Design a protein around this ligand. Structure first.
Ligand SMILES: NC(=[NH2+])NCCC[C@H](N)C(=O)O
Length: 229
């Protein structure tokens, strides 16, 4: 069983892409930290095992999970019907939606995806933001592995906008006063922890930890920890 494999090796293998503050990011000490890293530590601790974070490209997470290189994905991942075809998700643990970020020193203030037609828009490959902008034939989409590359591209004027999730948009804009979020929230997404569909033992265990975190007040402590910059 899944729990048995974890306990046999002595550590939980968690996949994520650490370019997504405040969920998983590289801090001033060069350490991977964040809200999701803390969720990962709670799950591992409650299993009686150590934690191993496996950092990788975002679009590699699902295939890493299906190919059994990781036990679980905790990486700011939106629950979607398409992804539910191939993995299972925990109870939702956060709400977000896509927003559009542009340079402040420009007249351009897009409010919808249709406002991006005729523009060049940077996205992280494989995300819900990529999926949505990709629907609009007149958007010139530039896809990146890391949001740090997408913001560099935006800041230097090579792209007109970046489309990404609300909370991480706000985290990036807080550090970049040359940027602004021009749109409201364009989707209604929830984050989930992804596990293989056959690993219902692990899934149930993760749901129990989530429910306990909320009941105990520790979830609100974690929110305060990561959303009070
Ligand atoms: N750690 C990350 N880069 N996460 C990107 C998540 C973006 C979006 N919520 C999605 O599931 O597509």
């Amino acid at each position: 069983m899944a729990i048995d494999e974890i306990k046999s090796r002595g550590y939980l293998l968690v996949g994520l892409s650490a370019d997504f503050p405040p969920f998983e990011f590289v801090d001033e000490n060069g350490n991977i930290v964040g809200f999701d890293v803390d969720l990962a530590k709670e799950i591992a601790r409650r299993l009686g095992v150590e934690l191993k974070i496996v950092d990788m490209t975002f679009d590699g997470l699902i295939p890493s999970l299906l190919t059994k290189k990781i036990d679980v994905i905790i990486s700011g991942m939106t629950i979607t019907e398409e992804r539910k075809k191939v993995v299972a998700f925990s109870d939702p643990y956060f709400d977000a939606g896509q927003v559009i970020v542009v340079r402040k020193d420009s007249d351009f203030r897009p409010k919808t995806y249709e406002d991006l037609v005729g523009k060049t828009v940077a996205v992280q490959i494989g995300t819900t933001g990529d999926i949505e902008v990709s629907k609009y034939d007149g958007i010139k989409v530039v896809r990146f592995d890391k949001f740090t590359d997408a913001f560099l591209e935006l800041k230097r004027g090579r792209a007109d906008a970046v489309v990404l999730d609300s909370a991480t948009a706000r985290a990036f804009v807080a550090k970049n006063p040359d940027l602004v979020i021009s749109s409201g929230v364009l989707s209604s997404e929830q984050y989930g922890i992804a596990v293989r569909k056959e690993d219902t033992d692990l899934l149930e265990f993760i749901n129990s930890v989530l429910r306990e975190l909320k009941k105990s007040g520790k979830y609100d402590v974690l929110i305060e920890k990561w959303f009070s910059e």
